[PDB]
Each structure stands twice: as structure tokens, then as C-alpha cells.
């Protein structure tokens, strides 16, 4: 009873007959001859509930499970060709139906699928054009938390499985494995579904990005070009954030905690210096996990950021040298601070402000501290001590800048402070320098402060 496309009723025709003839091979012939074809599937239906009923009925038979698996392994490699060479989605926007149909299969996360079927399907799916991904993500964002968890788990198990099964080393990088890269791109697709499915507050919490004006040299070059008013361009924005119109920072509460997207096995194997390189320099044959930040743990991220900071410090050193070669002027390659123990706040202010006003690029040099009267090489210990002193002095109630809460043991800005906006600028700079120099500070701010730093106003819930 051959047919080109399939429906719940058409399936029922065989459920009864196969039971009546005590056979399954005809239904297996059917399902194979169906699900091996992308066109048959694309044409078969969007009918989510029908798909769910069908799976709930079919996956009850072991013989039929192997047929689904064997059909999927045949299907995906062809779908990859359609998307990569024929742009099928641009001809038929219903092509996405195929992936929706397959993803409702509950057994994709059993090991039999993880070894071959799911990887191939990930290779195909990860090639979808952005507009299609946006369509799919918007659908997933309506699913129940347990379902997001299932999908997340389906890819997490795969990334885990492949990281554990393969031997990775400084010559065999995780970045060179199509299976893990494809799986990660799929998982990214789920991640944004989790973001968009959470509580998102976009209309009452945006603060303006205040940028420090660059040094006169760059200003003149910007003036020599047509860019006098175009100082605000934003950092590297993720294409999916553009397509969805919602940033990771806009979601106040996701369906599943962002921490569950961190894949610890992957983080234990990933070499960040090379990833950062691939992040900075696009190579056709290599991927960068920094483009998928949700999967990296804070250690791995910090190591990437530390590579950024160090590469910049080193660039500023090169600029210092180049200036000295062409114009003879001798500039210091370090951010050398010299301060007196009895006037730490004042000396630090005047120096950092003279530096910020004369050359705002200098603040990006490596920090180096010298206490006037003391003698030693700042291998970080002098800097750490400087930070301790500054933080202690700034939080002293006698300076009136901050109020301390006995209950939470957290500090908050004193609204009544007459002190100049200078000291507040100084503490801001100190925090920056601490991140830049990877030094922990004993500062105790409530979450609202870090939200305001990122450009989001504190909302009632942050109290």
C-alpha cells in the first residue's frame, strides 16, 4: 500500500494490519521508505500533537525503533547537502518541518542514537540558515522547562560522550571535531530558546553606554575620516541575538539555570589560547567556543579574558616602542603608580586622573605600584597590598562615601555624600584594574551594582 507522505491515520492503517498479520516488516518497509526521504517528511504535515501521538504509539515496539534509527542515519547526510548546496529552505520555508518532526522523538538521547544517528543529525541541523534557526528557537521558547531540560540533556550527553570517547591533545584540538562543533551549535540553538523563554524586561531598564573620548591622535584620524559623531558602535554582537532581538542580558530569569549549560568535561579539555586565536582570526576550517560562551565555565572564560588583556597590554607596549622610534618620545610601558602610604586616595586620584586626561589609553597598561619610601619589585604582592589599603580606606564610614549593612555585610552608595565625583571615579577605576590584573578584592556589593555596571537599571526585584 505504497504512499508518498504519511499521517497519523495512515499509520493506524498499518498498526492494526501488522498486529493482525503478526508482522512488523511491512510497517518497517514503510517507515524506512518514508523517513529516509527529506521530501516525504517535509510534505507530510507542523502537526506537533499528531507527531507526539505517533511517537508515543510507535516507540513501544523495539523492532520499529531500530527502523527509525536506521532511517535517520540515512536521512541526515542528504539534508546537509540540501542546506549546503541547494538552499532548499529558501525555496520552501516548510523544510523546517523535518527537524521539528525528528526532534519530538523521545529516544534520541539513548546511547544507540548518541553514537551515530544524533551526531549526523546535528551536522545537518547546525547548517540551517539564520532565519530558519530564528523560527525554530521562537517555537522552542514555548516549551515546558522539563522539555528544555530534555533537549539540553540530549546535546549535553552528546558533547560529553564525544569528549570522553576521543583523545584530545595539543595536536588534536576539540576545535577540529565536526561532531562536537555541530553539537555545540545545536546546543546554542537550545540556549537561546531558554533565554527567550524566560522572563525578559526590555522596556524599563536600559542605561546609556558612556564611552571615554579617545586620545587626540585617534580623534584627529577619526576627524580626517567621516566619523566625527560615530563614536558608538557596540562590541561584537552575536548574529542570533540580532535575529531574535533579545540579548543574554535582557532575560531576568531563564527556564533552566544558565549554569546547567556549562559542560565541565569540555572545559577540562579546551585550550583557550588557541580558541581565543580562532575567535580573533576567522579560519574556514576551525571553530571557536568563545562564540558559544554559555558552554564555558568562569575559569575558562577568565582565561580567555586574560589573554585579551595580556595581548592588549603587549600591543600598547609595541605602540610605546613605535612612538619612541619615530618621534623619540619616551613613554612608560607600564601603568606605574607611585603613592604615599599617608595619602593613598589622593595620590592615586591625581595620578589616575592626570593619566586619564592626558592619555585615556594609558589605563590599559600593566599595573605596577610603588609606595613612596619602600623598595621592592611589584610581582603582584605590592599591587595586592595597594588594593587592600585602597578598599579599606574607601569603605571607612569616616569618608562617608558608602553605607554598610550589618545584616547582609554589603556596602551601598551613600546618597548624601558631599565627596567629589572624583573618589567615586577612583573606586570605579580600581575595580577595572583589578579585573584587568586578575586580583581578587574584598569588596561586598549587592547584585544590583554589577547589573548597573553592565548598563541595566536596578529594578524592584534587585532590592
Amino acid at each position: 500500500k505504497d504512499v508518498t507522505y504519511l499521517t497519523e491515520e495512515k499509520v493506524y492503517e498499518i498498526l492494526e494490519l501488522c498486529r493482525e498479520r503478526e508482522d512488523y516488516s511491512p510497517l518497517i518497509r514503510v517507515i524506512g521508505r518514508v523517513f529516509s526521504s527529506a521530501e516525504a517528511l517535509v510534505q507530510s504535515f507542523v502537526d506537533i500533537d499528531a507527531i507526539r501521538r505517533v511517537y508515543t504509539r510507535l516507540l513501544s515496539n523495539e523492532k520499529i525503533e531500530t527502523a527509525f534509527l536506521n532511517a535517520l542515519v540515512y536521512l541526515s547526510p542528504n539534508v546537509e547537502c540540501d542546506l549546503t548546496y541547494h538552499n532548499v529552505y529558501s525555496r520552501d520555508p516548510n523544510y523546517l518541518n523535518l527537524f521539528i518532526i525528528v526532534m519530538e522523538n523521545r529516544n534520541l538521547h539513548s546511547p544507540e542514537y548518541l553514537e551515530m544517528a544524533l551526531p549526523l543529525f546535528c551536522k545537518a541541523m547546525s547548517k540551517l540558515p539564520l532565519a530558519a534557526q530564528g523560527k525554530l528557537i521562537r517555537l522552542w521558547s514555548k516549551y515546558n522547562a522539563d522539555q528544555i531540560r530534555r533537549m539540553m540533556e540530549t546535546f549535553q550527553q552528546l558533547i560529553t560522550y564525544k569528549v570522553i570517547s576521543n583523545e584530545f591533545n595539543s595536536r588534536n584540538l576539540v576545535n577540529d571535531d565536526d561532531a562536537i562543533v555541530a553539537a555545540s551549535k545545536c546546543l546554542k540553538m537550545v540556549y537561546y530558546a531558554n533565554v527567550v523563554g524566560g522572563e525578559v524586561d526590555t522596556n524599563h531598564n536600559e542605561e546609556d553606554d558612556e564611552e571615554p573620548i579617545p586620545e587626540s591622535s585617534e580623534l584627529t584620524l577619526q576627524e580626517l575620516l567621516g566619523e566625527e559623531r560615530r563614536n558608538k558602535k557596540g562590541p561584537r554582537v552575536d548574529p542570533l541575538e540580532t535575529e531574535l532581538g533579545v540579548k543574554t542580558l535582557d532575560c531576568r530569569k531563564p527556564l533552566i539555570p544558565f549554569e546547567e549549560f556549562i559542560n565541565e568535561p569540555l572545559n577540562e579539555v579546551l585550550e583557550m589560547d588557541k580558541d581565543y586565536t580562532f575567535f580573533k582570526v576567522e579560519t574556514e576550517n576551525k571553530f571557536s567556543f568563545m562564540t558559544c560562551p554559555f558552554i564555558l565555565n568562569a575559569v575558562t572564560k577568565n582565561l580567555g579574558l586574560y589573554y585579551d588583556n595580556r595581548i592588549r597590554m603587549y600591543s600598547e607596549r609595541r605602540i610605546t616602542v613605535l612612538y619612541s622610534l619615530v618621534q623619540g618620545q619616551q613613554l612608560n610601558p607600564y601603568l606605574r603608580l607611585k603613592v604615599r602610604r599617608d595619602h593613598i586616595i589622593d595620590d592615586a586620584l591625581v595620578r589616575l586622573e592626570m593619566i586619564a586626561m592626558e592619555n585615556p589609553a594609558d589605563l590599559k597598561k600593566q599595573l605596577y605600584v610603588e609606595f613612596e619610601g619602600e623598595q621592592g619589585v611589584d610581582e603582584g604582592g605590592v599591587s595586592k597590598e595597594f588594593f587592600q589599603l585602597v578598599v579599606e580606606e574607601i569603605f571607612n564610614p569616616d569618608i562617608g562615601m558608602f553605607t554598610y549593612d550589618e545584616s547582609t555585610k554589603l556596602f551601598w552608595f551613600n546618597p548624601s555624600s558631599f565627596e567629589t565625583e572624583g573618589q567615586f571615579t577612583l573606586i570605579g577605576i580600581v575595580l577595572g584594574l583589578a579585573i584587568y590584573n586578575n586580583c581578587i578584592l574584598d569588596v561586598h556589593f549587592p547584585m544590583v551594582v554589577y547589573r548597573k555596571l553592565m548598563g541595566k537599571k536596578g529594578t524592584f526585584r534587585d532590592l
Binding site: 591622535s217 580626517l224 558602535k233 557596540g234 561584537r236 600591543s315 605602540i319
Partner: protein, 142 residues
């Protein structure tokens, strides 16, 4: 005088006619060194599609040495990331032919032929401070 901040000509040809003079007649100072440009440099400034900078109503240009120097410094300072032309087209949803790209060494705008060369030789375009740059023929040969 050009003491009106908004209403002074921006491009050298305009300044020629505004001062009732030709590019063959005009003499200008470089904005950094205030040295006089060689006529060869004046022509190139017109060819590089650069803007006159004004201080107190006085026009200034930029000579070759200064331009290359400050451009190279700006590269070392505000480099962001490097993409393939193909990828760049997708990020900006426009063909490379139409996208504004200048020479990283000498600011000259890149011709579609040079843009094609970047695609042919699988070479990347660099984002500096948020503007895109490549290497023109006269800078990829040196």
C-alpha cells in the same frame, strides 16, 4: 575664512573652488607636523577621499608619512577581529562590492577589483574601532 564650524568645505576639490584656486595652485599644511605637503602628496590626499581638518578657520591636510604612521598606530591600538569577505557580507547583509572598506596602511578606499582579490586569495578584512579595512594593491605589493 572657515571659522564657521559647520559650513566650511570638507573635501579638497571643494576647498579649491571655495578659495577660487585649483589643486595646482593651493598650498596646505599637514595637521600633525604643520609641514607643507609635496604636490604629489596633495594629489594623493584628493585621491584618498580624506576630509580637511580645520583649526581656528585654517585648513589642514595630511602628508604621506604622517598618514601611514598614525594609521599603523591605530591598527596596533584598536584591532578588533578579522573576517573573510564572504562572512563579512553575511554579517552586513550586503555584497562586498557595496561595503565601505579602506586601506589599512594608507586609507585609500578599496576598489571592487581589490575587494575581489581579497576573496580570491582567501584574505581577511580587519575591523578597527568599528570600521573595516583591507590592503590595496599598492600596499600588498611593496
Amino acid at each position: 575664512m572657515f571659522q564657521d564650524p559647520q559650513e566650511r568645505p570638507r573635501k579638497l576639490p571643494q576647498l579649491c573652488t571655495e578659495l577660487q584656486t585649483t589643486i595646482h595652485d593651493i598650498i596646505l599644511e599637514c595637521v600633525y607636523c604643520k609641514q607643507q605637503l609635496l604636490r604629489r602628496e596633495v594629489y594623493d590626499f584628493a585621491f584618498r577621499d580624506l576630509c580637511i581638518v580645520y583649526r581656528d578657520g585654517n585648513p589642514y591636510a595630511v602628508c604621506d608619512k604622517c598618514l601611514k604612521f598614525y594609521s599603523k598606530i591605530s591598527e596596533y591600538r584598536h584591532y578588533s577581529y578579522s573576517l573573510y569577505g564572504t562572512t563579512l557580507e553575511q554579517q552586513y547583509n550586503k555584497p562586498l562590492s557595496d561595503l565601505l572598506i579602506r586601506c589599512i596602511n594608507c586609507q585609500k578606499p578599496l576598489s571592487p577589483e581589490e575587494k575581489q582579490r581579497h576573496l580570491d586569495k582567501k584574505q581577511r578584512f580587519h575591523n578597527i574601532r568599528g570600521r573595516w579595512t583591507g590592503r590595496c594593491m599598492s600596499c600588498s605589493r611593496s
